[PDB]
Write a protein that binds this ligand. Structure first.
Ligand SMILES: COC(=O)c1cccc(-c2ccc(O[C@H]3O[C@H](CO)[C@@H](O)[C@H](O)[C@@H]3O)c(Cl)c2)c1
Length: 158
């Protein structure tokens, strides 16, 4: 089991870390949602699918920088919504193919009432998401750590 970003940066068998760089809606008013769809940015596959099935959770997700200070939100994982920053590990998604396929994670963030101006600075760290992978074959328990960075400013108008 291994993963990569949309630009080909890989995390190999056994886990590791990588940076993910995301475009963000540039203007989000209070009351609107900023969507950070990682399913178009992070892909994974199973390396021995005829014998092994891989099980993948979002173990935990943390907010940083302007997301931590200026937004509240949820994380949607494979169709179900949870608090973000996270308060539990999600259920499993099954990876049963050698085809790289999306990791089905998206953040839904909305500004706090006091937010205004540049609420997320371009280039800044906005989140760290831990993908946790186990299987039905051995005791493997690996983390793929995704450090999520903004490619552009997000403004909450005043
Ligand atoms: C087509 O494959 C073959 O012919 C073949 C032949 C011999 C051995 C293997 C093989 C490959 C990968 C394996 O472990 C990695 O991949 C697992 C499946 O994603 C993960 O659960 C596990 O954690 C680890 O990332 C293991 Cl244990 C065995 C494959």
């Amino acid at each position: 089991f291994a993963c990569k970003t949309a630009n080909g940066t890989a995390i190999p068998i056994g886990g590791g870390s990588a940076n993910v760089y995301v475009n963000l809606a540039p203007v989000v008013n209070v009351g609107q949602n900023l969507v950070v769809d990682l399913s178009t940015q992070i892909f994974c596959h199973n390396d021995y699918p005829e014998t092994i099935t891989d099980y993948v959770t979002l173990q935990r997700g943390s907010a940083y920088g302007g997301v931590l200070s200026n937004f509240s939100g949820t994380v949607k994982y494979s169709g179900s919504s949870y608090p973000f920053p996270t308060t539990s590990e999600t259920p499993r998604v099954v990876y049963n193919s050698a085809t790289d396929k999306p990791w089905p994670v998206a953040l839904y963030l909305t500004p706090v009432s006091s937010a205004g101006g540049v609420a997320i600075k371009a280039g800044s760290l906005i989140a760290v998401l831990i993908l946790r992978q186990t299987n039905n074959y051995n005791s493997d328990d690996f983390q793929f750590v995704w450090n999520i960075y903004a490619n552009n400013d997000v403004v909450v108008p005043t």
